[PDB]
Amino acid sequence: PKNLINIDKPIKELPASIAIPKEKPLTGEQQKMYDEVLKHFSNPDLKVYTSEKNKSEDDLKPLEEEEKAWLTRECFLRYLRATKWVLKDCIDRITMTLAWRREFGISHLGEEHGDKITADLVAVENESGKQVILGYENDARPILYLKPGRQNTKTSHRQVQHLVFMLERVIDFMPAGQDSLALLIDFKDYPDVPKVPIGVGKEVLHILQTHYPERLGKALLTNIPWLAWTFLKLIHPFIDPLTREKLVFDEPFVKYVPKNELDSLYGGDLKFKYNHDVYWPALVETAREKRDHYFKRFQSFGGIVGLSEVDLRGTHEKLLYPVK
């Protein structure tokens, strides 16, 4: 019996023991395309749709300060890679995500600035700890645990709102220099949690594919029921090699996560029991700290579109990536 590490709150900072991967350098034509996107969203006269769902050319609103802070160098790069470096597609996708973010109630970088999705709104959804932000894996990705066997609410739109909220918070926890997350999915049934319309799948799929490009860096799956397990194993080789590498179906998590960063349930050193009244306020306060820092940094650098997340999340006095 090993000696585990007590923990009941999210790990605030990436430990120094985990290095941040180096970014792939951009070809000449890629930089040129990047500059066009930068130019498009730097336009002082830019106006975008008030929603995605009900978008109209005749109902537009110029960018808010908070939207400029979201429109980062890496945001541009995520969409460029998602759209396979097609300039018009990149611009439209970004535009539509801005549009969706206003509609959904998350365009203001936090409830502190007017977001309608609040911590208090979705807190009940996390009551049984069905989603947990905790730790960092080998490539400095923040970890999001998903535990559908701990489901505590009935299907509703609020489930989607919680889903999006937790995604935004795990993004708040990104270390400077990283912009993708790791999903750790535990499919076990937990009877300890009492089990309680339109299936939310379609909306969640639309949200993940359309508004969260290039965010899934790793997905680790464990405690898979037999039929699902068999299915996943039968199809794994037929999955495209570059997607295949991102997906791990029932292998030890310890090979992708350092032990002191991993829950002991899955072979790690962390002794974690979800305690809502302790965990939830810690996550909310920690996420808020990160956002305050990020936004202060953004204003200190001119409050312009195109700033780097490396700089906005970092602490160096001078910009590592100055804006053209």
* 42 part of the interface to Mg ion, by CB under 5 A: no
Beta strands in 101-180 (DSSP E): 131-136, 142-146
Question: Where does residue 240 rank: exposed (0-12), middle (13-18), buried (19+ CB within 10 A)?
Answer: exposed
Query: What is the C-alpha separation between 13 and 20, in angstroms, rounded?
Result: 13
Selection from Mg ion, a second copy, none that 197 binds (CB < 5 to 8 A by kind) is: none
Could you tell me the smallest distance in angstroms from the CB atom of residue 116 to Mg ion? 17
Q: Select from a second copy, Mg ion, none the partner in contact with residue 16, using the beta carbon and a kind-dependent cut-off of 5 to 8 Å.
A: none
260 with 270: CB under 8 angstroms? yes
> How far apart are the C-alpha atoms of 250 and 233, rounded to whole Å?
9
The secondary structure of residue 263, as a DSSP letter, is B
- Which of 54, 156, 209, 275: binder of a second copy (CB under 8 A)? 209
Among 42, 50, 83, 210, binds Mg ion (CB under 5 A): 50
Instruction: Give the residue, chosen from 212, 229, 266, 280, that forms a contact with a second copy under the rule CB under 8 A.
Output: 229
Q: Is 59 in the site for Mg ion (CB under 5 A)?
A: yes
The tokens of 201 are what?
């799948």
Residues closing a segment before a gap in the chain (C–N exceeding 2.5 Å): 196
Q: Is 204 in the site for a second copy (CB under 8 A)?
A: yes
**Parallel, antiparallel, or unpaired for β 142-146 and 131-136?**
antiparallel
CB atoms within 10 A of CB 199: 8
Question: Among residues 53, 234, 315, 316, which is the contact residue for a second copy, using CB under 8 A?
Answer: 234
**CB nearer a second copy, residue 44 or residue 237:** 237
**Which of 18-26, 83-91, 135-143, 227-235 is the region at the interface with a second copy (rule: CB under 8 A)?**
227-235
Residues that bind a second copy (CB under 8 A): 146, 148, 155, 199-201, 204-205, 208-209, 224-230, 233-235, 238-240, 243-244, 247
Residues that bind Mg ion (CB under 5 A): 50, 54, 56, 59, 173, 175
